[PDB]
């Protein structure tokens, strides 16, 4: 007999998904403080459950203030790859600026191009 198929960490991951989806759904209405409360509760349950953030909702939030970042409204997203490949998220509310360095994927593409050169 199997009554409990869903464990504590599974319901924790479901609460992560539901809370951050409701954060996105409520952040577009005009209440950024309610969305900050959702991100704060999701971050508190992430540090409490010792579970990692999903890669979908990972870069959509700010670590300093906690505002859910709408790209374009209160978040400026620019891709610069002259010196090193990076995608920069800029919070318009407080001013915290984060980025996405892509050096090792460029290294993998570079090794694939070296293999295509040496085979040819």
């Amino acid at each position: 007999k199997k009554f409990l198929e869903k464990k504590l960490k599974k319901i924790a991951y479901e609460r992560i998904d539901i809370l951050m989806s409701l954060a996105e759904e409520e952040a577009k209405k005009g209440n950024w403080d309610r969305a900050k409360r959702y991100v704060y509760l999701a971050r508190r349950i992430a540090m409490k459950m010792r579970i990692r953030f999903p890669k979908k909702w990972k870069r959509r939030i700010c670590k300093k203030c906690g505002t859910f970042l709408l790209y374009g409204r209160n978040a400026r997203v620019r891709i610069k790859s002259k010196r090193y490949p990076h995608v920069v998220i800029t919070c318009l509310e407080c001013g915290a600026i984060y980025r996405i360095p892509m050096i090792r994927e460029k290294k993998e593409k570079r090794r694939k191009k070296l293999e295509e050169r040496l085979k040819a």
């Binding site: 009554f3 504590l8 924790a12 809370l19 409701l22 409360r37 349950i45 409490k48 459950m49």
Partner: protein
């Protein structure tokens, strides 16, 4: 999915709710969704447009799931939902 057994640990925010019994007479008859949740308090926005502050331990709640309607005391919902999903065991005896 949200189950009637794990509704003691599922998140209450984002679910329609009505209360059926309470000691406050004017509390009976409200219908709305859950927005904010603290240790023994729900902040419920009515369909009419009024925000109400409902204590949990004085009333019983009927949560509307995907088709389901589950009646749970707020005495079972004691604690912040953070600590409630940590682990909260509540055993109630209405003698």
């Amino acid at each position: 999915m949200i189950t009637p057994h794990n509704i003691l640990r599922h998140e209450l925010i984002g679910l329609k709710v009505e209360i059926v019994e309470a000691k406050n007479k004017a509390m009976i008859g409200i219908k709305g969704k859950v927005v904010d949740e603290t240790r023994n308090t729900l902040v419920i926005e009515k369909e009419d447009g009024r925000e109400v502050v409902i204590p949990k331990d004085i009333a019983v709640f009927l949560f509307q799931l995907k088709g389901c309607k589950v009646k749970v005391d707020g005495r079972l919902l004691i604690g912040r939902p953070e600590e409630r999903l940590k682990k909260k065991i509540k055993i109630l005896y209405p003698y």
